[PDB]
Amino acid sequence: IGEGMLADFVSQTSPMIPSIVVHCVNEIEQRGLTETGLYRISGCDRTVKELKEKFLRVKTVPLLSKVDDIHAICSLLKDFLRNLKEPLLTFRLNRAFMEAAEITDEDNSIAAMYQAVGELPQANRDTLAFLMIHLQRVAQSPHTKMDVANLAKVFGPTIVAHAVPNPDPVTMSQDIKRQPKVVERLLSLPLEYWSQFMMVE
Amino acid sequence: MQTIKCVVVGDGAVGKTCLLISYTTNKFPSEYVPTVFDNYAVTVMIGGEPYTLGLFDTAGQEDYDRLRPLSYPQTDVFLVCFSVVSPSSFENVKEKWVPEITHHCPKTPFLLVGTQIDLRDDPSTIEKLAKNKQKPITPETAEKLARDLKAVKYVECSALTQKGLKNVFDEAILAALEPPEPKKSRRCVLL
Ligand SMILES: Nc1nc2c(ncn2[C@@H]2O[C@H](COP(=O)(O)OP(=O)(O)O)[C@@H](O)[C@H]2O)c(=O)[nH]1
Ligand SMILES: [Mg+2]
């Protein structure tokens, strides 16, 4: 167990996204996107771990078509992301992203966000884009009751996280307070913007 | 002064926050928002004595697994909550929550708390469960897990109707006091 870097799970070159991510998202969107609490409700832990163990052996994405509780997939996705050796936004850009979201001027904040994203290795930008597009849909389904702020409170610890492997108790509590605002900005970027990274080639 | 630290843990959306608010304010929260971390308080009068009950709310999402342990230190009792109408949340009690607190607080008591019992008669709810060929958790099933996992007691309630709400906390108060060994022997400690 343990997982490696994000890039260690990409096979296709365009866009550079892990199959595991692609499949979870497709399934979640497949089931309609109308279940209350998507990503807020935990799937069955035993199930999430068993699906994960199959996968991590040689990176064989299992069929999710028959997993009935859709939350177990939401959980399986976040679990995959949250356990990479380095967060989706990478260690190197952790602060950058945080301070670009704290810029009180909306525009300049939006501008520094574009700059930071463009800094990420391609795999993370593509994978991140895919996710922002996915979540913007989730946030747009009334039934989910999961608005941008909710998603931001649940995904912030996952794709933003920390600037180091093991933060100390204080610095940790600090990052957590800052993560949400970062996810908010990312979600506020136009779909057009995110979509350009989705073209094959 | 004698303060009682109670930390509530459990899957997201089971109703941790709702029971803390309904109890302390007699008002049921309408909003649908995830809890990062919070802590309320109340002075209770049991045995004719003034007791301060420090309540600690936490995030059930696995995403907060590293930040949650920060509220454990000095805990006198844990309320491990699951929704009686969410079989998976009941499942994660033995597969995750009990393992977690006993790994951080080996000496701290904890009560199994079944929440949202009023939903056992919700037309929509029951049908969504059967749709997946599932059913709600019965008091008897929970009481068994309670014993198996060495919980002090099993209690359930509806934060909506407050049915069994006050009682949950009463038992949670007794669990931290009633024992013969000093209150200290049950208080959690870091590392
Ligand atoms: N019907 C019903 N719904 C409840 C009850 N308690 C909580 N809920 C709902 O369950 C969802 C999550 O509640 P919340 O207290 O935030 O759970 P938490 O994520 O553990 O803090 C919300 O829709 C609450 O209104 C209850 O006793 N009865
Ligand atoms: Mg809450």
UniProtKB/Swiss-Prot annotation, chain A:
Phosphorylated at multiple sites in the midbody during cytokinesis. Phosphorylation by AURKB on Ser-42 at the midbody is, at least in part, responsible for exerting its latent GAP activity towards RhoA. Phosphorylation on multiple serine residues by PLK1 enhances its association with ECT2 and is critical for cleavage furrow formation. GO terms for biological process: actomyosin contractile ring assembly; erythrocyte differentiation; mitotic cytokinesis; mitotic spindle midzone assembly; monoatomic ion transport; neuroblast proliferation; positive regulation of cytokinesis; regulation of attachment of spindle microtubules to kinetochore. GO terms for cellular component: acrosomal vesicle; centralspindlin complex; cleavage furrow; cytoplasmic side of plasma membrane; cytosol; extracellular exosome; Flemming body; microtubule. Changing residue 51 to Q: In CDAN3B; decreased function in erythropoiesis as shown by partial rescue of multinucleation defects in RACGAP1-deficient erythroid cells; decreased GAP activity towards RHOA, RAC1 and CDC42. Residues 4-194 form the Rho-GAP domain. Highly expressed in testis, thymus and placenta. Expressed at lower levels in spleen and peripheral blood lymphocytes. In testis, expression is restricted to germ cells with the highest levels of expression found in spermatocytes. Expression is regulated in a cell cycle-dependent manner and peaks during G2/M phase. Keywords: Acetylation, Cell cycle, Cell division, Cell membrane, Coiled coil, Congenital dyserythropoietic anemia, Cytoplasm, Cytoplasmic vesicle, Cytoskeleton, Developmental protein, Differentiation, Disease variant, GTPase activation, Hereditary hemolytic anemia, Ion transport, Isopeptide bond, Lipid-binding, Membrane, Metal-binding, Microtubule, Nucleus, Phosphoprotein, Spermatogenesis, Transport, Ubl conjugation, Zinc, Zinc-finger. This is Rac GTPase-activating protein 1. It comes from Homo sapiens (Human). The lineage of its organism: Eukaryota, Metazoa, Chordata, Craniata, Vertebrata.
From Swiss-Prot, chain B:
SMART domains: RAB (SM00175), RAS (SM00173), RHO (SM00174). GTP binds at residues 10-17, 57-61, 115-118. GO terms for cellular component: apical part of cell; cell leading edge; cell periphery; cell projection; cell-cell junction; centrosome; cytoplasm; cytoplasmic ribonucleoprotein granule. Transmembrane segments: none annotated. It is a lipid-anchor; Peripheral membrane protein. The modification Cysteine methyl ester is found at residue 188. Plasma membrane-associated small GTPase which cycles between an active GTP-bound and an inactive GDP-bound state. In its active state binds to a variety of effector proteins to regulate cellular responses. Involved in epithelial cell polarization processes. Regulates the bipolar attachment of spindle microtubules to kinetochores before chromosome congression in metaphase. Regulates cell migration. In neurons, plays a role in the extension and maintenance of the formation of filopodia, thin and actin-rich surface projections. Interacts with CDC42EP1, CDC42EP2, CDC42EP3, CDC42EP4, CDC42EP5, CDC42SE1, CDC42SE2, PARD6A, PARD6B and PARD6G (in a GTP-dependent manner). Interacts with activated CSPG4 and with BAIAP2. Interacts with DOCK11/Zizimin2; the interaction activates CDC42 by exchanging GDP for GTP. Interacts with DOCK9; the interaction activates CDC42 by exchanging GDP for GTP. Interacts with DOCK8 (via DHR-2 domain); the interaction activates CDC42 by exchanging GDP for GTP. Interacts with IQGAP1. Interacts with NET1 and ARHGAP33/TCGAP. Part of a complex with PARD3, PARD6A or PARD6B and PRKCI or PRKCZ. This is Cell division control protein 42 homolog. It comes from Mus musculus.
